[PDB]
Design a protein around this ligand. Structure first.
Ligand SMILES: [Zn+2]
Ligand SMILES: [Zn+2]
Lengths: 21, 30, 30, 21, 30, 21, 30, 21, 30, 21, 30, 21
């Protein structure tokens, strides 16, 4: 998931928006 | 915006910045 | 442990420290 | 909620555990 | 994205997140 | 400037991009 | 509470959270 | 010590309490 | 260097930066 | 102490060095 | 003052601390 | 440069002052 991806790879602020409420 | 390498507490700070008063879930695999 | 005033991103760092692997939700509307 | 407990007022690490998944 | 009150070092962390590899200037006199 | 926009007032991530080199 | 991997300034933030107004000593070996 | 342990291994918030005043 | 208002966890990050390997004490009762 | 010097008032990095071990 | 190992957002926090209201430029190579 | 040096090697607060405005 996101936690794993942003750390072991790279991620974007737009991917992070998927986790807002 | 640029790609991000975010580990640990740095990822939670980014979520806070992105989501704000909307809130967010922090849900690591395992 | 002690009682803290915890606000904004500081509150989310505290949740990360306390919850870690379990994950957490930050929902300021609730 | 959390803001009212932990930011206006004061809260313990034990209260923070209420917000773990 | 949401609108945030961002102050002091929090403002500079936000600029780092948003700008990254491009770099940024922080000029509070301006 | 930035302080007035983002600290006294409120600002978006898009406004923050104005300060990238 | 869960186990923590805390390096650098992240360890000092955790001490601040745990100890609060009680204060704390930060004393690295060497 | 604690600094070394929390970083090279792992430590708990209860171990950290040993360092409060 | 410049004069800063430094509070709460920000004060402890500043002490970590300034003191590093020497370590520090944070004693707000004193 | 430190809070009064560095948080109510303003303090320099040199004053902060007074609190190094 | 002591030597610093500063990566990522930790370097920007140190710049903020050192420069304050003077401001600063954060300019990574590539 | 500074970003590279502080991370891959080591740097001092006095080197960082070179980047203030
Ligand atoms: Zn703060
Ligand atoms: Zn870090």
């Amino acid at each position: 998931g996101i936690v794993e991806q942003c750390c072991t790879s790279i991620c974007s602020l737009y991917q992070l928006e998927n986790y807002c409420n | 915006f640029v790609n991000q390498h975010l580990c640990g507490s740095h990822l939670v700070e980014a979520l806070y910045l992105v989501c704000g008063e909307r809130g967010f879930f922090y849900t690591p695999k395992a």
